[PDB]
Amino acid sequence: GNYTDFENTFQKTVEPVYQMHIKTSKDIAVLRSKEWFQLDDEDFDLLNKTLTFETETEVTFKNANIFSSVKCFGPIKVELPTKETVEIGIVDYEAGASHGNPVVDFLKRNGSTLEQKVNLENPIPIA
Amino acid sequence: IPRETIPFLHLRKKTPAGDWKYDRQLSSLFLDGLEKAAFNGVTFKDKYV
Amino acid sequence: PVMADLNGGLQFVPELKEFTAKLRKELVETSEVRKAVSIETALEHKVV
16 A cells, blocks of 8 residues: 555564674774763773674664664673673664664665675575 | 813804803813813714715 | 984884884874774664
8 A cells, every 4th residue: 555654653672682793902992982882881891702783673764764862782791711791881872864874774784694694605495 | 171271172152242252161061071071971862864 | 424313312222123013013003903993883874
């Protein structure tokens, strides 16, 4: 049909967990630039740590393409020497009339997912 | 090796200024190896020259 | 013969090779971190 019902239109996904290995000092300096990377202890040492970002993104619409409001939020966890995780941060990105979720666009490029599909050289016919 | 006397054979060491001075210690080590060579002699087995 | 030293105290900065090399490091390091932060702030604004 033809709906112009943008008041009652939304998107409330739970994004896939993304991890970053902070190896260098111009990786830590980037994360500190981002308003949306709140740490509990600001002095916390990120070097040679593996951060995982467990993030969900509420999005309301005003139009076909432009978003009325974007919202990304979730715990930031660090892998300890023992391989237990601990919360040491929160994502808290909020926006008005936006064309994108920058938080997920960041983590896609500068991070990775926990699993990675790898294609066979040649597809094998099963049946 | 008497003090205040530089031997006739001696090694040198580079000072922070860039010059090479007599070094008592290095020179001692050299002259002891040179004493043993005079008594026992020196081997060059497995030396390629 | 006259030997004129028109070198303004570089005699006395010790290990000048590795010093000069440390100085170029610190300028590049700073420039690179700053340029990487500048690239991401453009991408994460272009997206918004």
